[PDB]
Design a protein around this ligand. Structure first.
Ligand code: HEM
Ligand SMILES: *[C@@H]1O[C@H](CO)[C@@H](O[C@@H]2O[C@H](CO)[C@@H](O[C@@H]3O[C@H](CO)[C@@H](O)[C@H](O)[C@@H]3O)[C@H](O)[C@H]2NC(C)=O)[C@H](O)[C@H]1NC(C)=O
Ligand SMILES: *[C@@H]1O[C@H](CO)[C@@H](O)[C@H](O)[C@H]1NC(C)=O
Ligand SMILES: *[C@@H]1O[C@H](CO)[C@@H](O)[C@H](O)[C@H]1NC(C)=O
Length: 448
């Protein structure tokens, strides 16, 4: 029965940092003894909890979370089995089953040299900067910075949008009964996200109960190229070029840039819908009487959000809310990075400055969350199953095919069998798998 201790869970996992800027600070541990000393004295009491972060009046000036790799845990003398072999083997090893070469990876990600990540969030970079100083002064050479990624909410009216322009963070699983569910939102057991929580089938070490597996990915987005492809391949029609291009963009994502799901508004954006959390997730893909297996006029089968949360595609209720595939939910805590598109990139339709998403997913089993979604669903041209045509193609957004163009069907409303071959517009530079421990562990077992 008994519910989540939110005083002991790190905030990013369930609520997110709530800050304009974030820094991911990837480190190695040089001397364990010293390191544990400050881990306990200086990190642990300032680590931000879910309880802390969901009180308007209790937000720290700088929000800090911390998570450790397998090689990080080992370095701290912590040889316990966390019960995740994807976690133990590391993301570099997992790269092939993603149909991606580590040739474009951050060199520091393409191994197991990284022992952890500190996440710092704040509403300005100055505060982040000074907090880094203060951490580096305290820890001294008991730690090395191996790599860093700065990120922020996008500027102006683009706030809450990702670099392609699309409102993100509409959709997350509701944890029963932490969250009171919205219309259409999936509801899952806590133990889908929190290791050792309600109905996590996997044995954990006791110190790790209340943590989560953080899957990090630095995903470069080629925004000019994406926009040009949309203009170049927009379906014919009586609509303006710009409307038809936007239509193709939305059909790839499954939502208009305003966030309005195309399933409910298949022919034009509806920003009032997009802004309304009571409506903007309230759908299953079913419609009377179109049949689920062949109708792509509301939303392609290949659309990103359909590919990553299949809803009524994997059975269950046709009226919301659909609760299929609960065990395959991830909490998403990602945030854009890099500069806005510049005038010169827009003009040449060519990227020169690296920008994209610092993609963060939480889950209790890596094998059921990020990794599953990416390989079994996104990368699988027969997914969802039992469609006609059977060849859905790949996720136009994250689908991978060894750096070759992805074939994706369903996108063009006038002919669902019509294929487009789509260059990659998202380019993984790698990341790593971390374990974000309960806060008690941090000054407890890990520092002890
Ligand atoms: C640069 C790459 C990415 C971009 C631009 C992107 C963009 C978006 C957007 C615009 C949405 C709609 C917002 C929402 O429904 O809340 C979304 C939803 C979602 N994405 Fe991504 N995404 C990226 C990578 C990923 C990856 C790698 C995965 C996991 C393998 C993932 C899984 C999800 C899930 C689970 C949803 C919610 C679907 C739902 O609950 O209906 N995405 N994404
Ligand atoms: C979430 O979407 C569902 C549909 O999947 C909405 O349920 C539907 O809502 C309409 C109202 O627009 C229901 O019909 C209307 O409500 C009364 C109910 O007594 C009905 O008698 C009238 O015919 C009226 O048109 C419709 O029956 C209902 N469908 C189902 C399957 O329940 C729901 O309203 C949406 N939630 C939100 C917050 O928008
Ligand atoms: C960029 O793409 C647009 C639309 O296809 C085209 O009009 C324009 O000429 C391209 N820019 C350059 C520099 O080629
Ligand atoms: C639909 O696309 C398929 C595959 O390209 C093609 O063979 C068929 O001729 C198309 N039908 C129409 C009406 O374009």
């Amino acid at each position: 029965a008994t519910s989540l201790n939110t005083d002991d869970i790190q905030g990013d996992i369930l609520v997110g940092m709530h800050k304009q800027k974030q820094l991911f600070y990837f480190f190695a541990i040089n001397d364990p003894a010293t390191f544990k000393t400050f881990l306990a004295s200086d990190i642990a009491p300032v680590v931000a909890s879910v309880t802390q972060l969901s009180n308007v009046a209790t937000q720290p000036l700088v929000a800090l979370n911390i998570a450790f790799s397998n090689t990080g845990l080992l370095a701290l003398g912590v040889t316990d089995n966390l019960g995740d072999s994807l976690f133990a083997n590391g993301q570099a090893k997992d790269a092939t089953s993603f149909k991606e070469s580590t040739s474009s990876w951050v060199p520091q990600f393409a191994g197991t040299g990284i022992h952890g990540v500190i996440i710092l969030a704040s509403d300005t970079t100055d505060l982040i900067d000074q907090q880094v100083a203060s951490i580096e002064s305290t820890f001294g050479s008991s730690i090395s910075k191996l790599y860093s990624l700065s990120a922020s909410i996008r500027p102006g009216n683009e706030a809450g949008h990702e670099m392609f322009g699309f409102l993100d963070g509409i959709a997350q699983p509701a944890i029963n009964g932490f969250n009171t569910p919205l219309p259409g939102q999936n509801i899952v057991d806590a133990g889908v996200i929190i290791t050792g929580a309600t109905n996590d089938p996997i044995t954990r070490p006791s110190w790790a109960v209340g943590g989560s597996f953080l899957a990090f990915r630095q995903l470069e987005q080629l925004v000019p190229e994406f926009n040009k492809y949309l203009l170049d391949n927009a379906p014919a029609g009586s609509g303006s070029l710009q409307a038809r291009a936007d239509l193709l963009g939305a059909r790839m994502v499954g939502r208009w840039k305003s966030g309005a799901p195309i399933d409910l508004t298949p022919t034009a954006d509806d920003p009032a819908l997009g802004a309304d959390a009571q409506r903007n997730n309230n759908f299953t893909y079913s419609h009377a009487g179109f049949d689920l297996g062949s109708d792509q006029s509301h939303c392609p089968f290949s659309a990103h959000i359909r590919k990553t949360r299949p809803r009524a595609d994997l059975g269950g209720s046709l009226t919301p809310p659909n609760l299929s595939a609960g065990a395959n939910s991830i909490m998403r805590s990602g945030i854009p990075y890099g500069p806005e598109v510049t005038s010169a990139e827009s003009a040449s339709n060519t990227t020169t400055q690296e920008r994209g998403l610092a993609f963060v997913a939480y889950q209790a089993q890596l094998s059921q969350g990020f990794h599953f979604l990416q390989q079994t669903w996104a990368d699988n041209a027969n997914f969802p199953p039992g469609k006609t045509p059977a060849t859905v193609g790949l996720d136009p957004i994250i689908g991978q095919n060894n750096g070759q163009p992805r074939v994706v069907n369903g996108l063009l409303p006038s002919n669902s069998s019509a294929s487009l071959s789509i260059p990659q517009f998202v380019v993984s530079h790698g990341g790593e798998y971390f374990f974000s421990p309960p806060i008690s562990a941090i000054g407890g077992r890990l520092s002890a």
